[PDB]
Amino acid sequence: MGHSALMKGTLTLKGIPGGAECSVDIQGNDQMQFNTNAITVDKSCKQFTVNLSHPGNLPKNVMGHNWVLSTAADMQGVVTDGMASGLDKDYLKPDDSRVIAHTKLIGSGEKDSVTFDVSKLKEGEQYMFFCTF
C-alpha cells in the first residue's frame, strides 16, 4: 500500500572522478514512478540539492509524491510511521530523526527542492530515497 515499494532507489556517496555538479532533477508521475532508481552524490560536494517535480494531472491526495532520504536500515520505519502520520503531515512523522532530508508532498503541476549537507552522509553507508505516500 502506498508508493514506497515502487518509488524508491539507492543514494550513494562516491568519489566521482573529477567532481560532479551537486544536484539531481527527479520526477514522480501519474503512474507511481520516479524517473531514476539510483543517485550518486560526489564526496567533494558540500551541499546536494534534489529538485522534485510532478508532471501529469493527478492531485496530491490521489497521487502525491515526496522525496525522502534515510539509511536503508531506517527506510521501513520511516515509511511505516510516515504512512500512519497521514496526508495532512505529508506522510512523514514530524521531526523524524531518521530522515536525513525531505521535500514536501506535491501533486500535479507542483515543484519542490531540498538541499542538504553532504557531511550528513558517509562513504560505505547504504542510503535509500523514496516516496512515503
DSSP 107: -
Contact pattern from residue 13 through residue 42 relative to Cu ion, giving x for each residue in contact according to CB under 5 A and a dash for the rest:
------------------------------
Q: Looking at beta carbons only, is 29 or 103 nearer to Ca ion? A: 103
What would the x/- binding string for Ca ion be over residues 67 to 106, using CB under 5 A? Answer: ------------------------------------xx--
Given the rule CB under 5 A, which of 15-23, 49-57, 77-85, 125-133 is the region that contacts Cu ion?
125-133
C-alpha cell at 80: 511505516
What is the separation of C-alpha 71 from the centre of its chain, rounded to a whole number of angstroms?
11
The option from Cu ion, Na ion, Ca ion, none interacting with 65 (CB < 5 to 8 A, set by class) reads Cu ion
Q: 54 among the known binding-site residues?
A: no
Cα separations (Å) of 41 from 2, 94, 98, 109, 117?
A: 27, 26, 19, 27, 11
- Of 16 and 49, CB closest to Ca ion: 49
45 annotated as a binding-site residue: no
Residue 120 phi/psi, 5-degree rounding, is -70, -10
Classify 90 in phi/psi space as left (phi over 0), alpha (psi -120 to 50) or beta: left
Q: How far apart are CA 123 and CA 15, in angstroms?
A: 9
Binding site for Cu ion (CB under 5 A): 3, 7, 65, 131, 133
Give the annotated binding-site residues for Cu cation.
Answer: 65, 131
